[PDB]
Every structure is written in structure tokens, then in C-alpha cells.
């Protein structure tokens, strides 16, 4: 979604440094408001101490700051963040791999549902759409980006993902629960009907198609699960309490105390707490990692591009089972027909990458 | 890619020490430029303090260095590095195992696509090439090493990975999305056509071949996923901010202060901060681990050898389904035909490795 994969292809001088200059889906964009509030509260307190408090009050503030500063402990906060963010990141990738792709059903339906006639065409296209509908229905249930595109079941129909007859059949089936599973049932029934009409040769080929469907159903189930079963609220609250506890301490503890009073650790007044602000970016930004990925189907810069996926899948699916049904290119003898050990060419820039075969560590390289 | 597996086969005296003398894909090669800039900035600051600053300015610098040094904290940085690098290393190996190998399809196509005639040969060879094409297409989409070898679809054709007719069929199919999935559809269709021509006996054998294809498709999908879905930018930025924050502190904090002034902790002036530089190699090098593996399909020394894989697969694939179709050696009685409990010999050096059978922990060894 915010792909910088190509920038970090090689480990050169500024591989990671360069990324500090990027705004989209960045630490700056996510921390902006919070940082400003922190900045404000800090310097506000700072001026109160420098310009308002009396000599006696200043002595209390200095004692208060020494107290607060002693409770700004990074080690405990770093612990809970690391473990929590790891959980979030784990679920994040699991949710991606749970986004259903038509390609596997697509390959089978395209080759195993017979007929070069309009019915055979309508059959294959309708099967794929039942798959894609099964997906779109669950996606608009878990993704705010998708839901805002399909707020009502009418939107689904008018967008061409569901026919008005299908919508009629949809409504006819009375159930208080999410009906995303309906198209998945239709598919299996239609696949069976197709086999009985002789459009699907064996049962071996039919079960194979039914299996790939079930897999897609399992995919939709995972998405439902991650959406339903949030990371326990108490856990989420714990890490924010820990993080905020730290910044609360810093607000007062990291204040620049009187240099004259010669407090151990506070010999220099820089007015601006450079390293404390750098710690804020570190920890608040670290928390923002979880904050953004805790729901990867939202509208964050780094949240998944689910609507593009829907579009891509629609186009590719139908194309593969329609225009590509039993439609192949002209079989030719390959360029290496009489060559048992082919030696494909290399461009000028890639010849260094033509390596001798790795036989194994145990063998002498001679 | 940088295989030292054989060097570290045994745990001897210098098993790991020896690796410190290696340059290829080393910590030295990856840190070179960064280290020099660090070195320079350090000693630059050092001379300014020793030769330029006035007695009063020197006192400020010393107070500034004590301030900076107190913010050079390894524990928080070590935390975020460990967790982040672990994520990177995890994806790194996942991406490797997602590189498709023909061998499984290769075995089935070679034995289950009948015919010792030119057509049977052309059939088997064309099937494998559709697999290898499905792979090469995705690899040149995710690997810069491969793309620079196949920058254009013409390169693919001229290299003998795709026929001009196939390229024509390729273009004929209108789609705005990556067409790496096309050959995978062709394969399934061609496999079905092959079965209808009687070249594939049962549907059981056909579905078995279609399954291994789908598996390869899933492999290609994973590669696409890891390439598309980068590790969240914010996370990457956080760890570089943390790391750089540390080295910023060290630049000033680790300066050798006046020995005469007798600052606690700064009693000795060595001019060169040995241990601070050693910490740089540690942490900057630790970050370089992630920096290099965040995209294992790039052109780093330790990035995958994808082009060799392509070459190896091409050679082996075709060879197994062509020259090796129904082609076996002469069946003989094995050397242990009349021996129920064979005792294969051992070389002089390996006799110590002839062990008695491990029956289980519970049994008395008598």
C-alpha cells in the first residue's frame, strides 16, 4: 500500500536514511498532532517555571522534576511495546494472507467447466462471480474502505457484483446473521448442477473445484475472525497506560532545571530537550505502528488496498474463465528443443550473476 | 548466496572468529561509508574541542558532552532492533521458500503425460515451460537482479523462455494488471486438452497435475505479496530514528573530555574511542542485517541468486520431462537382495559414526 520495496532493494549508504524524508505513511504524519500537544505542554510548563513561579515554588518544582524524572523508565515500556507490537504485526500479516484470491478456483473453473457455447460461457462466468461475491461481501464487512464504496446491498448490485435476481434470492433466504456465506453455497450447488448437465466430466474434477471453494470460504472466515476477535482491550490499554506514564514523567522530569543550583544530571540548560523529543518520536512512533496495523483494513496510508484487489480480481477472474477457456497459443518447438543444457543469455549489467551451480557445502569447489 | 555453511560445520576454536576475516557480504563492506562519516565527524569535533574552543567554551562543551552521553542508552535500542530484525529475518526466509521450484510438477508431467512421439515430447516440454514462465514473470517483477536481465517482454522471448506466438497471445489478452498468472491458466487448459487427446489417462492423474500447478501459483502469489506489502514504513523509520539517536549522542557524549578537570567517568584520554567504535559496528551492523534482508531479491551479496535458479530450473525441468520420459535404467537385483539386515561399509574416517540403533530413552542400554 505504501510500497518502498524497490528503494530498499540494496543495502547502500542511505538505504534507510532516505526513508526519513518520506511523508506518506510516515512517522511524522502519524505523530504530528500528538507531538504538537507534547511540545506545547512542555514549553508551557517551562515558561511557568522560568517566568511565573517564585523562588520558593521553583525549589518545589525542581524537587518535583527530580521525582518525575526518576520514573521515566524506558526498559519496562520497551518490553511491553515489543511484545504487543509483535502481536499486532503478526495478526497484520495473517489478515493479508486471509484476503481471498480467485486464481486457484479460476484455473480449475476455466479448464474443467466444458462448453464453448453461450451457456458454457454463462456457467463459468457465474461461478467465478459467486466466488468474488463471497469475497466482496466479507470485505465490506471488515473494511471501512470497502464499505464506504458499498454502503448498501444495492451498491453491490448496481456495481455489477450481484444480479437483481441474485439479490432477490438473497433476501428470500431469511437469516439474522451475515449472509456472506450464501454465494459460497450457490457456487457448490451450481458446480454440482453443472456436473449433472455433463459440463463437468468426473467427480474427481468436481470435488477438486469444491475444495478450492471451501478454501476460499476458510479465507473469508479468517477475515471475519480477526474483525470479530479484537486484541483484548485490557492488553491494548496496558500498553497505552505504560507509554503515557512515560511521557507524563518526561513532561515535568525532563524540564531544564536551574543550572546554578547545580543538580547532579542537570548542569546544562538547552531550553529545547532534543533527546527527550527524539525519545518521543521513538516510543510514540513505536506505538503508532500498532495503532496503524491493529486494523489493516481501515483507511490509513499503510492499510491494505482492498478496493483495488476487488477490481483486479473481477477483471482477471472473468477473463480467465471466459476469453481464456480452452484458448491456447500455437504450440511451437521451443528455442531449446535440441539443446539439453540451455544457456539463456544475460544482459551486460547482469552477467556477473551467471554463477556456477551450487552442488552442496560438502563438495570441494574445484 | 554467500554460503559459509561448510566453514561452520564443526564448532572448533576459530569457527566464528575466522568469519571476521571475510569481506564478501561482510559487516565491513556494508558499514564502510557510514563508519568513515562517523569517524570523520567524531575526530572533527574532537579537534575543535582540543584546538579551537576557548577555556570557557571548552567548559560548555564538556557540560554538553555529559548531557549527550547520558542519553546514549543501548537497552531501548537493542529492544527495537531485536524485534524488528526478527520480523525482517522471518520474512526473509518466507520469501525464499516462496521461490517456486518445478521439481514437483516436473515429476508428474514427466511420468503422466504419455507419448514417445514428437507431439508427446512437445506436449511435455510446453507444459513445463508454462510453469517456468509463470515463475520468470513474477521473479522479474520482484527481483531487480532478474529484471535487469529481462527489462522488457522481448528479452523474455529472445532468451527462449517464451515463444513469439505465446507473446502474441499474451498481448491479445487485454488486462491492466500483472499478467504473470497467464501461463498458469494456459497450463491448466493445456493439461486438460492433453487429457482429452488421451495423453493423460485418468482425471485422478490430471487433478494431481492441476494441484501442483495451483501450488506453484500460490508460490508466485506469496512473492507478489511480500513485494507489494512492505514492512510498514513507520516501523522502519522508528528503528532508524532510535539507532541514529544513539549515534548522535555518542558523537558528542563519547568525546574524550579534559582529564585534568577530573570528571567522574572520564579519567583517561585515549583520543580514539575504541569501545564506542565497537558499539558502532555492533548496532549499525545489526541495523545493516535488516537493511540487507528487507529485500532479499535485490543485488546485495547476501541477496538470493534468482537468476541461477531460473537457469537451473530451465535445464532440469525440460530434461526430466523429455530425455527422462519413461526412460529408466536396467533393473537389477540390488547388492542386498539376499541380505535382510544389510551392513553398508564405512570409510576409515567415518567408522566412528557407525552407531547402535537408538531404541528409545526408556530402554536400558545393555
Amino acid at each position, epitope marked *: 500500500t505504501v510500497t518502498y520495496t524497490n528503494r530498499v532493494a540494496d543495502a547502500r549508504l542511505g538505504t534507510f536514511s532516505q526513508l526519513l524524508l518520506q511523508w506518506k505513511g510516515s512517522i511524522y504524519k502519524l505523530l504530528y498532532s500528538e507531538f504538537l500537544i507534547f511540545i506545547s505542554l512542555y514549553f508551557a510548563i517551562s515558561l511557568v517555571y522560568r517566568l511565573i513561579l517564585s523562588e520558593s515554588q521553583r525549589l518545589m518544582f525542581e524537587k518535583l522534576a527530580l521525582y518525575c524524572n526518576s520514573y521515566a523508565e524506558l526498559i519496562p515500556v520497551s518490553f511491553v511495546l515489543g511484545f504487543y507490537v509483535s502481536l499486532v504485526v503478526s495478526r497484520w500479516w495473517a489478515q493479508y494472507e486471509s484476503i481471498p484470491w480467485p486464481d486457484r478456483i479460476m484455473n480449475l473453473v476455466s479448464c474443467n467447466v466444458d462448453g464453448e457455447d453461450e451457456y458454457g460461457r454463462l456457467l463459468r462466468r457465474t461461478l467465478m462471480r459467486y466466488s468474488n461475491l463471497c469475497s466482496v461481501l466479507i470485505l465490506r464487512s471488515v473494511s471501512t474502505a470497502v464499505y464506504k464504496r458499498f454502503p448498501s446491498m444495492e451498491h453491490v448490485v448496481r456495481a455489477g457484483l450481484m444480479t437483481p435476481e441474485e439479490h432477490k434470492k438473497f433476501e428470500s433466504l431469511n437469516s439474522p446473521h451475515n449472509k456472506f456465506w450464501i454465494p459460497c453455497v450457490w457456487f457448490s450447488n451450481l458446480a454440482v448442477k453443472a456436473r449433472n448437465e455433463g459440463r463437468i466430466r468426473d467427480s474427481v474434477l468436481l470435488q477438486g473445484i469444491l475444495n478450492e471453494l471451501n478454501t476460499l470460504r476458510s479465507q473469508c472466515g479468517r477475515l471475519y475472525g480477526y474483525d470479530w476477535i479484537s486484541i483484548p482491550l485490557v492488553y491494548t490499554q496496558v500498553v497505552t497506560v505504560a507509554v503515557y506514564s512515560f511521557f507524563l514523567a518526561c513532561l515535568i522530569g525532563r524540564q531544564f532545571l536551574d543550572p546554578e543550583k547545580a543538580y547532579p544530571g542537570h548542569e546544562l540548560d538547552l531550553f529545547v530537550p532534543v533527546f527527550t523529543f527524539l525519545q518521543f518520536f521513538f516510543y510514540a512512533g513505536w506505538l503508532k505502528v500498532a495503532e496503524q496495523l491493529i486494523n489493516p483494513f481501515g483507511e490509513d496510508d499503510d492499510d491494505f488496498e482492498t478496493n483495488w484487489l476487488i477490481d483486479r480480481n473481477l477483471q482477471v477472474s472473468l477473463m480467465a474463465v471466459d476469453e481464456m477457456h480452452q484458448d491456447l497459443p500455437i504450440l511451437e518447438k521451443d528455442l531449446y528443443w535440441n539443446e539439453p543444457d540451455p544457456q539463456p*543469455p544475460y544482459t*551486460a549489467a547482469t552477467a556477473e550473476y551467471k554463477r556456477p551451480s551450487f552442488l552442496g557445502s560438502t563438495f570441494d569447489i574445484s | 548466496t554467500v554460503t559459509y555453511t561448510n566453514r561452520v560445520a564443526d564448532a572448533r576454536l576459530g569457527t566464528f572468529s575466522q568469519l571476521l576475516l571475510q569481506w564478501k557480504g561482510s559487516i565491513y563492506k556494508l558499514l564502510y561509508s557510514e563508519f568513515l562519516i562517523f569517524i570523520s565527524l567524531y575526530f572533527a569535533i574532537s579537534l575543535v574541542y582540543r584546538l579551537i574552543l576557548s577555556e570557557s567554551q571548552r567548559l560548555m562543551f564538556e557540560k554538553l558532552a555529559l548531557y549527550c552521553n547520558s542519553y546514549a542508552e543501548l537497552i531501548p535500542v537493542s529492544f527495537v532492533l531485536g524485534f524488528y530484525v526478527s520480523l525482517v529475518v522471518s520474512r526473509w526466509w518466507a520469501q525464499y521458500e516462496s521461490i517456486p521450484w518445478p521439481d514437483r510438477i516436473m515429476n508428474l508431467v514427466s511420468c503422466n503425460v504419455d507419448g514417445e512421439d514428437e507431439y508427446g515430447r512437445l506436449l511435455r516440454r510446453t507444459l513445463m515451460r508454462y510453469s517456468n514462465l509463470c515463475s520468470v514473470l513474477i521473479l522479474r517483477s520482484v527481483s531487480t537482479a532478474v529484471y535487469k536481465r529481462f527489462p*522488457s517482454m522481448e*528479452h523474455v522471448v529472445r532468451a527462449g523462455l517464451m515463444t513469439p506466438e505465446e507473446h502474441k497471445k499474451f498481448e491479445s489478452l487485454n488486462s491492466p494488471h500483472n499478467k504473470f498468472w497467464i501461463p498458469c491458466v494456459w497450463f491448466s487448459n493445456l493439461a486438460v486438452k492433453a487429457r482429452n487427446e488421451g495423453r493423460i489417462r485418468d482425471s485422478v492423474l490430471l487433478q494431481g497435475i492441476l494441484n501442483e500447478l495451483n501450488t506453484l501459483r500460490s508460490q508466485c502469489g506469496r512473492l507478489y505479496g511480500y513485494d507489494w506489502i512492505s514492512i510498514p514504513l513507520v516501523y522502519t523509520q522508528v528503528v532508524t530514528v532510535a539507532v541514529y539517536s544513539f549515534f548522535l549522542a555518542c558523537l558528542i557524549g563519547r568525546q574524550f573530555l579534559d582529564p585534568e578537570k577530573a570528571y567522574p567517568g572520564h579519567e583517561l584520554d585515549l583520543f580514539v574511542p575504541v569501545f564506542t567504535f565497537l558499539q558502532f559496528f555492533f548496532y549499525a551492523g545489526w541495523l545493516k542485517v535488516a537493511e540487507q534482508l528487507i529485500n532479499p531479491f535485490g543485488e546485495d551479496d547476501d541477496d538470493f541468486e534468482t537468476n541461477w535458479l531460473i537457469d537451473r530450473n530451465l535445464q532440469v525441468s525440460l530434461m526430466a520431462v523429455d530425455e527422462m520420459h519413461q526412460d529408466l535404467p536396467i533393473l537389477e537385483k540390488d547388492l542386498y537382495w539376499n541380505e535382510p539386515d544389510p551392513q553398508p561399509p564405512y570409510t576409515a574416517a567415518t567408522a566412528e559414526y557407525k552407531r547402535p540403533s537408538f531404541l528409545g530413552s526408556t530402554f536400558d542400554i545393555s
Partner: antibody
Amino acid sequence: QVQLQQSGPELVRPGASVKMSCKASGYTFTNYWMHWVKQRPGQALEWIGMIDPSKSETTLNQKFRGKATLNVDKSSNTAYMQLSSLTSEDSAVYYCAREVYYFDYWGQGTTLTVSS
Amino acid sequence: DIQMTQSPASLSASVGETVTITCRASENIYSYLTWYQQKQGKSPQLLVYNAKTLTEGVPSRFSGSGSGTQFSLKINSLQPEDFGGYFCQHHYGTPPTFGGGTKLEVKR
């Protein structure tokens, strides 16, 4: 149809610098590496260097390290080469070619003459 | 660098004849060799690539062969057009050095 149109011939004084062009058309500019070849009478063709239109990555010949400079303009689909500290020996015919495991398309050529 | 040694420096033959130019590699370049034809004043043209494969326009009378360090171009049944310059180039690595060239002149 693939066509590489280079700039016209040039005439410069020793020590100066020159910058010749090469406009590609009839194919995707960024998907093929652009090379530059030097042609002197009696001598063999010399490879100056190559450029990746996409990322502007250059790879020169050690023999031309300080003499030649490469860059492109993806917007205008043209490639450029700059020759510095020109001498009499820098006088020759300069080509730009497209690579596809081979040089399948060359420019007409750009004749450079250096004398005072 | 890889050195390309071409021979003969110049060949003289009459229409109908069959000639053979030869390029030899300093080191193994597998099947990575190309043959170019260049007529005086004009820019070179691709004849053969990958040591054997002929390009689009090239007529069947042209053929390439070899592998490793020994390659050769063979023009059987010469024509009036086939007279001019001929050189080779390896395509295994950078820099892709060229051959010395060969002048194919008419014999009388």
C-alpha cells in the same frame, strides 16, 4: 518502428566540452539499456558505457572514466553523452545503440571533430 | 577484459563464393557472441546473435556457429550486397569488446 535519432555533427576546440543526444522512438524507452560506441578509422569499435533509462544508473568503461558522462530524459525519450577535456583523439563517430542481449538498433551517428 | 581476435583482417572473393570469418575469445563466453555487418559510411546492422540465431531481415545464406572461445561467420553463395565490413562482439559482461573487423572485397 524502432528509430534512434542522434544530434548533428559537432566541431569544437581542444580542452572544451560537448554534449550529443539520441532520441529513441517506436519502443518503451525505459525497458532497454542504452549504450554508446566510439568509432575511429583503423581502430576497433570502443564501448564507452551504458545507461539504465529507468533509474539513470550508469556503467562506464574504465578507459572513459573521466572523459564521458551519461544521463537521460525519460520525459523526452532521449539519451545524452557528454565528453570533457576534448583532445584530437576524441575525434570520431559516436553511436547510441539499444540492447536486447545484442545491439539491434543503432543511431545514424554523430561525427565529432576536435582541432584548433 | 575479454579480448576479441578477428580473422582474416580482409577477405577477397567473387560472387557465388563461400567465405568464413572467425572470431576467437580470450576466455569462455559460452554462446554469447553477435555478428554485425557495416557498409562504409553507414551504421552497423545486426546479423547473428547468440552465436547462431539469425535476426529478422538476414537471408538464409548467412550462418553462425561456435561456442566457448571459437566462433565463425559463414556466408555461402555471396551476392553483390554482401560486400563490406564485418565484425563481432561478445555479450558476456562489461565491457562488451568488439572484434578488429573484416573487409570483404571483390576479387578480380
